[PDB]
Protein backbone atom coordinates (compact mmCIF):
# COMPACT_ATOMS: atom_id res chain seq x y z
CA UNK A 1 0.00 0.00 0.00
CA UNK A 2 2.74 2.21 -0.67
CA UNK A 3 1.86 3.71 -3.63
CA UNK A 4 -1.66 3.24 -3.57
CA UNK A 5 -3.13 6.52 -3.53
CA UNK A 6 -0.01 7.67 -5.60
CA UNK A 7 1.57 5.61 -8.78
CA UNK A 8 4.64 3.79 -8.18
CA UNK A 9 6.05 5.40 -11.39
CA UNK A 10 6.29 8.12 -10.47
CA UNK A 11 8.25 8.83 -7.39
CA UNK A 12 11.00 7.28 -8.89
CA UNK A 13 11.09 10.26 -11.27
CA UNK A 14 12.51 12.05 -8.25
CA UNK A 15 14.63 9.08 -6.60
CA UNK A 16 16.65 9.04 -9.53
CA UNK A 17 16.47 12.54 -10.51
CA UNK A 18 17.13 13.60 -6.99
CA UNK A 19 19.85 10.82 -6.36
CA UNK A 20 22.30 13.77 -5.99
CA UNK A 21 23.56 15.08 -2.38
CA UNK A 22 20.88 17.41 -0.44
CA UNK A 23 18.79 17.71 -3.60
CA UNK A 24 16.25 14.70 -2.53
CA UNK A 25 13.91 16.41 -0.22
CA UNK A 26 9.76 15.76 0.97
CA UNK A 27 8.63 19.28 -0.48
CA UNK A 28 10.31 18.83 -3.22
CA UNK A 29 9.11 15.30 -4.75
CA UNK A 30 5.38 15.76 -3.76
CA UNK A 31 4.93 18.17 -7.04
CA UNK A 32 7.02 15.58 -8.55
CA UNK A 33 5.50 12.06 -7.88
CA UNK A 34 1.54 13.01 -6.72
CA UNK A 35 1.40 14.60 -3.30
CA UNK A 36 1.03 18.03 -4.59
CA UNK A 37 -2.60 17.76 -4.63
CA UNK A 38 -3.01 16.00 -1.75
CA UNK A 39 -5.21 18.08 0.95
CA UNK A 40 -4.17 16.64 4.70
CA UNK A 41 -6.80 13.66 3.42
CA UNK A 42 -4.35 11.01 1.76
CA UNK A 43 -1.20 11.77 3.36
CA UNK A 44 -1.65 9.58 6.66
CA UNK A 45 -3.74 7.16 3.93
CA UNK A 46 -0.52 5.48 3.18
CA UNK A 47 1.43 6.15 6.20
CA UNK A 48 4.11 5.12 4.55
CA UNK A 49 5.34 8.71 3.85
CA UNK A 50 5.88 10.37 7.32
CA UNK A 51 7.73 7.53 9.54
CA UNK A 52 7.48 3.76 9.94
CA UNK A 53 6.57 4.13 13.29
CA UNK A 54 3.70 6.11 14.34
CA UNK A 55 4.28 5.88 18.04
CA UNK A 56 4.36 9.53 18.18
CA UNK A 57 7.11 11.40 16.40
CA UNK A 58 10.18 11.18 14.27
CA UNK A 59 13.93 10.84 14.17
CA UNK A 60 17.01 10.68 11.85
CA UNK A 61 16.62 7.01 12.49
CA UNK A 62 13.64 6.67 10.31
CA UNK A 63 15.00 8.42 7.73
CA UNK A 64 18.12 7.13 6.51
CA UNK A 65 16.23 4.18 5.36
CA UNK A 66 13.39 6.54 3.49
CA UNK A 67 14.41 6.04 0.05
CA UNK A 68 15.18 1.81 0.74
CA UNK A 69 11.10 1.93 0.61
CA UNK A 70 9.69 3.22 -2.37
CA UNK A 71 13.79 2.33 -4.17
CA UNK A 72 14.25 -1.37 -5.34
CA UNK A 73 16.72 -1.94 -2.25
CA UNK A 74 18.30 1.87 -0.92
CA UNK A 75 21.04 1.39 1.50
CA UNK A 76 21.33 5.05 3.04
CA UNK A 77 20.89 8.61 3.06
CA UNK A 78 23.22 11.74 3.52
CA UNK A 79 23.42 13.93 6.71
CA UNK A 80 21.29 16.57 4.71
CA UNK A 81 18.62 14.69 3.21
CA UNK A 82 17.34 13.10 6.15
CA UNK A 83 18.02 16.21 8.29
CA UNK A 84 15.52 18.28 6.07
CA UNK A 85 12.72 15.39 6.65
CA UNK A 86 11.74 16.16 9.65
CA UNK A 87 13.89 18.75 10.91
CA UNK A 88 12.95 20.79 7.84
CA UNK A 89 9.10 21.14 8.33
CA UNK A 90 8.74 23.65 12.02
CA UNK A 91 10.40 23.53 14.88
CA UNK A 92 7.08 23.09 17.11
CA UNK A 93 8.35 21.39 19.76
CA UNK A 94 11.78 19.96 19.12
CA UNK A 95 12.24 19.55 15.31
CA UNK A 96 10.05 16.27 15.55
CA UNK A 97 7.15 15.61 13.25
CA UNK A 98 4.06 14.80 14.79
CA UNK A 99 1.20 14.24 11.95
CA UNK A 100 1.34 18.15 11.86
CA UNK A 101 4.29 19.21 10.50
CA UNK A 102 4.84 17.34 7.47
CA UNK A 103 0.89 17.85 6.55
CA UNK A 104 1.50 21.71 6.52
CA UNK A 105 4.82 20.90 4.57
CA UNK A 106 3.03 19.44 1.63
CA UNK A 107 -0.74 21.16 2.14
CA UNK A 108 1.66 24.69 2.46
Known sequence: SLTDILSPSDIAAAL???QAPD???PKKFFQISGMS???????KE???????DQSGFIEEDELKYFLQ???????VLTASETKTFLAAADHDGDGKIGAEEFQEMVQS
Open 16 to 18: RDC
Open 23 to 25: SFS
Open 37 to 43: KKSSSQL
Open 46 to 52: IFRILDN
Open 69 to 75: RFESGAR
